[PDB]
C-alpha cells in the first residue's frame, strides 16, 4: 500500500489557519502556487478516470511516478532477477499495467494498480514471418497460391511453446520480448518442425490457399521477404547506389547488409538496420508440387494434411 499524496495534511496544516474573523485573508503567493502543484496531481488523476470510466492503461506517471513504481517493484515479493527486469524496462511495465479506481471514503481515495508478474524469463524466443507463395504466371487469376498462417512469436515455456499470433501485442526491447500469456496458444515443441520440414507428419502445419496473386513484402528482423507476382516491378535499393537488385517473379529474400530500401510496386519499404547474421536456405517452392486442377483454392483456415485429404 502506498500513500502518494497527502492533501489532508497540506490543507489542514499549511493553509486553512486563516483566522476567518470576516477576513480569512492570510495568504502568500507561494502557498497559492504550492497548493496548485499539490492539487494538480489529483486533478489529472480525476481527468484520466473521467475519460476512461475508472480503468486506465498504460498507468500514467500521474497515477504512479517512476520513483513510486520503482519503489513498488523493489518491495514486490519476486526474484531479484524479476526486480532487475522490471526496473530496467519500466516503460514496458507501465504498458502492461492497469489502474482501477476502487473507493473514495473515510478521507481516503484509493485505486489499485495491477502490475505484471513475469514468471517466464530468459527462455529462447523466435519470430516467424510468412509471405504468400504463388505460382509465377504472368496472367491474372491463373495462379494457385499458398501461405503459412502460423506467423507470430514463439517462446519456450514449461516444456511447451507459447505462441502469440498477434505479434503487435508483444513489445521488443533489443533482444528481449515482452508478451502476455492471455493472448497466447500453448503448442507442443514439434511446432518448430514446420520450419525444418513443412511436410512432417508429427505436426500438422497451418496454411491457407488462394488464387489471388498479389505482390507484397514482409520486413523481417534482419532482412525482407519479397513476393513478386504478375507484372509488378519489385526492386531492392541502396541509399548510396540506387537499385541494386530486380526481383523476379516468386518469393525471394534479401538481407539488410547492403540494402536499405525495398520497393514492391508503388509501395516503398525501409528495412531494419539491426545487426545480425542472415542465412538463405535454398529449396524448391512447395507450390510447384500441387496440381492446379485438383487444388483446393479457398481454404481460409486449413493445414497441410487437410489440403492433402481434399486432394
Amino acid at each position, epitope marked *: 500500500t502506498f*500513500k*502518494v*499524496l*497527502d492533501l489532508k*495534511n*497540506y490543507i489542514d*496544516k499549511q493553509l486553512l489557519p486563516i483566522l476567518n474573523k470576516q477576513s480569512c485573508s492570510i495568504s502568500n503567493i507561494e502557498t497559492v502556487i504550492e497548493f496548485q502543484q499539490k492539487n494538480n496531481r489529483l486533478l489529472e488523476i480525476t481527468r484520466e478516470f473521467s475519460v476512461n470510466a475508472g480503468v486506465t492503461t498504460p498507468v500514467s506517471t500521474y497515477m504512479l511516478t517512476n520513483s513510486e513504481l520503482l519503489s513498488l517493484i523493489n*518491495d514486490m515479493p519476486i526474484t531479484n532477477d524479476q526486480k532487475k527486469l522490471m526496473s530496467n524496462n519500466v516503460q514496458i511495465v507501465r504498458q502492461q499495467s492497469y489502474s482501477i479506481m476502487c473507493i473514495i471514503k473515510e478521507e481516503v481515495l484509493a485505486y489499485v494498480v495491477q502490475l505484471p508478474l513475469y514468471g517466464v524469463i530468459d527462455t529462447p524466443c523466435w519470430k516467424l514471418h510468412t509471405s504468400p507463395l504463388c505460382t509465377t504466371n504472368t496472367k491474372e487469376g491463373s495462379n494457385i497460391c499458398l501461405t503459412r498462417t502460423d506467423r507470430g512469436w514463439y517462446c519456450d515455456n514449461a516444456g511447451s511453446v507459447s505462441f502469440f499470433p498477434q505479434a503487435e501485442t508483444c513489445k521488443v526491447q533489443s533482444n528481449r520480448v515482452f508478451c502476455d500469456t492471455m493472448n497466447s496458444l500453448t503448442l507442443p515443441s514439434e511446432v518448430n518442425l514446420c520450419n525444418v520440414d513443412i511436410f512432417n507428419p508429427k505436426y500438422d502445419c497451418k496454411i491457407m490457399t488462394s488464387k489471388t496473386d498479389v505482390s507484397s513484402s514482409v520486413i523481417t528482423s534482419l532482412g525482407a521477404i519479397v513476393s513478386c507476382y504478375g507484372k509488378t516491378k519489385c526492386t531492392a535499393s541502396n541509399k548510396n547506389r540506387g537499385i541494386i537488385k530486380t526481383f523476379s517473379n516468386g518469393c525471394d529474400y534479401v538481407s539488410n547488409k547492403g540494402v536499405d530500401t525495398v520497393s514492391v510496386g508503388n509501395t516503398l519499404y525501409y528495412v531494419n538496420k539491426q545487426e545480425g547474421k542472415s542465412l538463405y536456405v535454398k529449396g524448391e517452392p512447395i507450390i510447384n508440387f500441387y496440381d492446379p486442377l485438383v487444388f483446393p483454392s479457398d481454404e481460409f483456415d486449413a493445414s497441410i494434411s487437410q489440403v492433402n485429404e481434399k486432394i
Partner: antibody
Amino acid sequence: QVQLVESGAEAKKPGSSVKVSCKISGGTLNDYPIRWVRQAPGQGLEWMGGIIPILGTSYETQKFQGRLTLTADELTSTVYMELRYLTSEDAAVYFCATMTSPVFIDALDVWGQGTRVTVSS
Amino acid sequence: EIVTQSPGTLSLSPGERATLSCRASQNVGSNLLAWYQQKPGQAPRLLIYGASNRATGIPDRFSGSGSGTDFTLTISRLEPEDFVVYHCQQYGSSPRTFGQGTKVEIRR
C-alpha cells in the same frame, strides 16, 4: 546499515523550547520516515509523533499538537523535533526511530542513541 | 489502546522460562503487536513484530503468541543478558500506545 545519531543531552528552564536532532546514516531521508518517541525515567515509552519527508508531511499525537513541531532537512540528511511550553512532566529521554521494511508498519526496527532532556528549575 | 503489561517485575533464575503478558483494552487490529527489549540506559531493541514474527538476528529463544486482547512473550531459557526491561507496543490503531514495561530480574 541504517542508523540514527542524535544530539547531546539538554537541560532547559520551564516554558522554553528544546530542539533535538537526528541524523540518518546508511539510508535516504525519503526512504525512512522518522518517528519520535519518548519515555520519562522509570516510566514506559510514549508515542509522540512522526515525519514522512517524502510526502513532506508530519503528525503528532493529541497530547502534543500545538507544542511539537517536526521538520526535515534533506541536504544534511537530518530531522529535527521541537517541543515548547515545557513542564516538569516533559523531562525524559527522546528517541528517533525507523524501520527497515514495509511489513513492520509501525514496529520500530532501528533506533537513535537517545537524548536526555531535563526540564530544570 | 490501553495495553497494560503483567507482572510488574519477574523474578526467575537464569536458564528458566520467562512468560510476559500484555493485555489490551480492546482488540488490537490485525494483531499488530510488537515486543521490544531495552537494556539499562540504551535504545530499545525490536524483538517481535506482528505478535508472532521475530525480527532479524533475534535468537529463537524469544517467541511471541496471542491474539485480540491478550498477547504473550516467552523466553525459553533466560541468558544472563536477558534480565532487562521488555515493552509491548500496539500499532493496529492510532495513536500507537506502549505498555508500562516488565522487569526480569535474577532470583537468588
